[PDB]
């Protein structure tokens, strides 16, 4: 169902094309089964942030607590993104998702 | 005390792709002030 799988243990930076926009996502996992269940869960996490851009709060998934954060994207004017001929519009904020286990 | 369930969080329901430059027609460009 989902798009590309995640580095589970380690930090990663993911660019995402959604509507006419490019989102910069950074994922961090703290003190930490079935690959695509986790993929779908982190994707669901992204979609949630993407649907609450100005209304960020920590949430609980099946396995995790996601604390999304939003920082200015420094030097975005320096970058152009294209999908073939189509200009993609950068959302000029970095989303950092800090993912902990619920326990 | 307790965090909101993802189930109660509204979410973006659209097509969503990894922007991977050099893939699926995707290209990224960095401003320069020198040329070669």
Numbering used by the authors:
A (entry chain A): 1 to 32, 39 to 109
B (entry chain D): 174 to 209
Excerpt from the publication:
TERB1 is a molecular scaffold that simultaneously interacts with TERB2 and shelterin subunit TRF1. Knockout of any components of the TERB1–TERB2–MAJIN (TTM) complex impairs the telomere–NE attachment and results in infertility in both male and female mice. In the present study, we characterize the TERB1–TERB2 and TERB2–MAJIN interactions and determine the crystal structures of the N-terminal domains of TERB2 and MAJIN in complex with TERB2-binding motif of TERB1 and MAJIN-binding motif of TERB2, respectively. To reveal the structural basis for the interactions between TERB1 and TERB2 and between TERB2 and MAJIN, we crystallized the TERB1587–659–TERB22–116 and the TERB2119–220–MAJIN2–149 complexes and determined their structures using single-wavelength anomalous dispersion (SAD) method at resolutions of 3.3 and 2.9 Å, respectively.
Our data revealed that a short fragment of TERB2 at the C-terminus (residues 168–202) is sufficient for interaction with MAJIN. In the TERB2MBM-MAJINNTD complex, MAJINNTD adopts a compact fold with a curved four-stranded β sheet (β1–β2–β3–β5) holding helix α1 in the center. The TERB2MBM polypeptide forms an extended structure that wraps around the surface of MAJINNTD. The driving force for the binding of TERB2MBM to MAJINNTD is van der Waals interactions. The highly hydrophobic TERB2MBM polypeptide meanders along a hydrophobic groove on the surface of MAJINNTD and buries a total of ∼1300 Å2 surface area at the interface. The C-terminus of TERB2MBM and the loop between strands β3 and β5 of MAJINNTD contact each other and fold into an intermolecular anti-parallel β sheet that packs onto the central β sheet of MAJINNTD to further strengthen the interaction. It is worthy of noticing that, although there are three TERB2MBM–MAJINNTD complexes in one asymmetric unit in the crystal structure, two protomer complexes apparently form a heterotetramer with an extensive hydrophobic dimeric interface between two MAJINNTD molecules. Consistent with a recent study, this observation suggests that TERB2 and MAJIN could form a heterotetramer with a 2:2 stoichiometry. In particular, located at the center of this interface, the side chain of Phe192 of TERB2 is buried in a pocket formed by a group of hydrophobic residues of both MAJIN and TERB2. Again consistent with the crystal structure, substitution of Phe192TERB2 with a negatively charged bulk arginine residue completely abolished the TERB2–MAJIN interaction in 293T cells.
